[PDB]
Paper text:
Ferritin is a cage-like protein made of 24 subunits arranged in octahedral 432 symmetry with an outer diameter of roughly 12 nm and an inner diameter of 8 nm. The symmetrical positioning of three or four subunits in the protein shell results in the formation of eight channels connecting the inner cavity to the outside and allows for the entry and exit of iron and other cations with a relatively broad selectivity. In the present paper, a high Tb(III) affinity LBT sequence has been genetically fused at the C-terminal end of the heavy chain of mouse ferritin. The tag has been designed to be located inside the 250 Ǻ3 wide inner cavity such that the lanthanide ions diffusing through the surface pores could eventually bind to the LBT sequence.
The structures of wild type apoHFt-LBT and HFt-LBT Tb(III) were determined by X-ray crystallography at 2.85 Å and 2.65 Å resolution, respectively. They both crystallized in I222 space group with 24 identical subunits in the asymmetric unit (ASU) with a solvent content of 64.7%. However, the model building process allowed to position residues just from 3 to 176 since the LBT loop was not visible, probably because of the intrinsic high flexibility of the C-terminus region. In a similar way, in each ferroxidase center and 3-fold axes of wild type apoHFt-LBT structure, a significant electron density peak was indeed observed and ascribed to iron ions (refined with occupancy <100%), since, although no salt was in the crystallization solution, the X-ray fluorescence scan displayed the presence of residual iron atoms. As a matter of fact, residual iron (5 atoms per ferritin 24-mer) is consistently present in recombinant ferritin H-homopolymers, most likely due to iron uptake within bacterial environment. Accordingly, the crystals of wild type apoHFt-LBT lacked these emission energies.
Residue numbers in the entry:
A (entry chain L), B (entry chain S): 4 to 177
C (entry chain T), D (entry chain U), E (entry chain W), F (entry chain P): 4 to 176
The structure:
Amino acid sequence: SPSQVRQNYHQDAEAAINRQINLELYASYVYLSMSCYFDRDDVALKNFAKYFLHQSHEEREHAEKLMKLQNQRGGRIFLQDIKKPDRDDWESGLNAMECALHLEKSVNQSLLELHKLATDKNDPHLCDFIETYYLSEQVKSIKELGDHVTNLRKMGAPEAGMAEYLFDKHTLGG
Amino acid sequence: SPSQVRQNYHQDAEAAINRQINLELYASYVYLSMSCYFDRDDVALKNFAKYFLHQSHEEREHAEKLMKLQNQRGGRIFLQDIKKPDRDDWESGLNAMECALHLEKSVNQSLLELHKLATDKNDPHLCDFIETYYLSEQVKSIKELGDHVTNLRKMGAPEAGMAEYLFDKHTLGG
Amino acid sequence: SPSQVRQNYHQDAEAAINRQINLELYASYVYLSMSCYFDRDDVALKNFAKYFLHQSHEEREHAEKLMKLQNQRGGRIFLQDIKKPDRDDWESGLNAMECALHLEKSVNQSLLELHKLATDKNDPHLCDFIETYYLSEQVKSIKELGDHVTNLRKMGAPEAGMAEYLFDKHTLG
Amino acid sequence: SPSQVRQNYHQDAEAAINRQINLELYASYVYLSMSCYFDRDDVALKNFAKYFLHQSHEEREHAEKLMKLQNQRGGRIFLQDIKKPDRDDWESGLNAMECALHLEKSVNQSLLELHKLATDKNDPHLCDFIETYYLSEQVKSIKELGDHVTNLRKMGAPEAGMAEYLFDKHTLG
Amino acid sequence: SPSQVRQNYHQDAEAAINRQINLELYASYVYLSMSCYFDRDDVALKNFAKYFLHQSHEEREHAEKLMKLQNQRGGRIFLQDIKKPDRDDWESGLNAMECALHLEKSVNQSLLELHKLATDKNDPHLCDFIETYYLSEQVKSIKELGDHVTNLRKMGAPEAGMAEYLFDKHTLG
Amino acid sequence: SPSQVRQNYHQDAEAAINRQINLELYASYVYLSMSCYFDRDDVALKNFAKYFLHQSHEEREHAEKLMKLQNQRGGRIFLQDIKKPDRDDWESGLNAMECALHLEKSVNQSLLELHKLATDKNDPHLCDFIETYYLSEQVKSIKELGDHVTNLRKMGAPEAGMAEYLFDKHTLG
Ligand SMILES: [Fe+3]
Ligand SMILES: [Fe+3]
Ligand SMILES: [Fe+3]
Ligand SMILES: [Fe+3]
Ligand SMILES: [Fe+3]
Ligand SMILES: [Fe+3]
Ligand SMILES: [Fe+3]
């Protein structure tokens, strides 16, 4: 019945990876929607779009790595519907960063509980895997997104329209 | 209020793109699933997996180009749920190619009707856009999957053991 | 009388090319006027000048390619006067971008009508020629101009001083 | 049963491609004959021969590119006899160019008939395939051949001796 | 009020530069009409068109430089209609060279009058500008067009049709 | 009536070359049929396709060299209809090789008769021409196709599915 490679891999941990894979693919789809917003003619911020397009592809990459982990440990992949993002119009550059900040913190919460579940079942490989390739990256993203909000707020976006334009050119342009 | 860049871009075409975007994103999620199936330890065909992963990212690329088209013509993007693949287990190498063959014909089928619509609304830009970047790619990709199914069939897949193993090395290896 | 190389080229289509050849040359002259407005000392926006001068050269290049299409298909070119632009002063960078957008949209409306006639006279080469080299760039340029107008509106041009100046260095530079 | 890759590909389109294939091969054979004529010791125009040899191999490629299309869409390649050229002695450099001009307009006419068949059966892939790789090249080859005739006529060929000799070196060489 | 940069720049000179700008744009637009003529399938002189297109682009660059002068000195550019060429059919290469020689001499005439105008108003910058970038160039152009008209006559154009063909390859190639 | 270059070139040998030209053009056509067959979606052997397409073009090179031979010896090229291949469906990789083997032996027989006839008429140049560029080349093609026929039979083609698929990669790739 079980996979020939399976060893110290609980069936609950297997299910939480399938949930995370879906939650990672959900993140990718949200960031893709954001990118499209800033590429609109009535928004027209290419480096906001380019930034969020890059973030979308990393989430696609994060989803694929869990799928490889699932198969590595002997667990089987089962995919669900990827839900559409909560909103289509994201208003402005600032709001998108704040929705993204919340999105990454939600993903981080799912990973922490996943790591908590991995610890409870004495799964040190899965605890190492989440520690190395995910928890560090989420802390880095959450801090980065927090910085972008901190500056945009100070600059006076979105009321002062010259704020988001100058952010797009300097911070996201290099 | 409406798009200042909009011109001769009928509102049904705008909607037909939104459904076409979801179709290309679906196809990517179908290919992603297939790639991971051959990555399982009880299937273990590396170049089958690597092949379908490439097809998935091309279907992702195709979706993003339609999303760019939507913004170019002054349309507005509205996203739906990306539905899961009809099955989780893809039986064998031959079967996945046959499922991919049929999938591409459904994607092409939609594009033809999208061209038919675009021709009836007298939109030469959207007609040439589909002609240039999609109909050529679909006919080429269907022919390719037709060739693979043939070779895997003649070789005796999947009951004959070396059929898919040798095909993974020779044809899908390079 | 008819040319040795003439085949499936309707006389209505032939004349429609010459009208377009004039419209492309007119668009070039409009863009040359715009470019010079920013070259003025009391406007002094050097990248707005480079931008519209480049568009002025490409509209000439578009006009040159339509002329080449006329001779390829055996039709005869008949040039008309080139009209002057409807205004000399363009006020600001934003206003010039908004005018340019309407110009490109009006040129596209001429190209769309030209494609219609080709379909109604069963000329597939002429339809392809317009599709391949013209409609693609119009939508692309229109979209680009739409972006420039959107950004400038939000920044607060032309009444906010640094709006157009900074746009000059960042987007156009 | 039909092919596994077949979709929106009519029976008349499939069969029209087979005729179009034989036409391109026939044209290749015509150009091949022209080329070998100028290699004769009593004609001896090397760049006339090398020019028409080049047009022979490009037709062969056009014929091979249709066969590629035939297999992609799920149709099947039925071949036919390639008819010998209507004449062997092409007389002069001017006459061969006039005969090639006629031949290229005939092939272009057949591709136009093929396009409206593809248009009638709502096959946009076959319409684009013809638009992209054939119609545009046929207009160029007809125009190119027309230009060559026009010069040779003004030079005074074939009565004028150095007309075809110098055209060989300058325009073709 | 006068521009901040305006100094020793008379309004008649300002107005005459704008009339010159139009004449430079007219000169350009004439050359393009010539270029289009030689690209025709019944004329088919490739380097003739090459030559006349080059002159069109240079006359365009001459006008753009005169516009830059207008803004440099403080003047303001007022554009006018660019009149169409006084004929559509240019008949021959020899005739187009004679019409071009005629054109350049007329443009030189205008600049000679623009120079004395500047001389009268004691404008040493504008006198130098015209001497440096225009008067020397117009004499060079007229001399070159003199040479081609001369060479084309002595060769026997346009009755000997091989003459214009060989002048296309050897002098303009 | 006799060509200025012609010497020791019997008119039977001239007529025989014209038949060989047609036979080489036939052989080129048969290979083109075979190549296209393996490019079908339901066959899908891309290197078999490449192998026979290469032979088709080398048969055209053989034909063209014979056409150059004809003009060198003052003979005149008279072209006939290129007959269509005996079949459209070539069945399998094995069958195509055996048909190719039969074709190369048919062509070789026609060459040996052409050489025999050339030896009867004491035409030592024509004998050497067929020895140097055709006879030695044919023996190789027949030997090479002999190997491919043997290996496919040994592997158990086409009944064993992997036979021709694997032969496609290792031998022909
Ligand atoms: Fe993630
Ligand atoms: Fe796709
Ligand atoms: Fe344009
Ligand atoms: Fe089209
Ligand atoms: Fe052709
Ligand atoms: Fe000038
Ligand atoms: Fe041979």
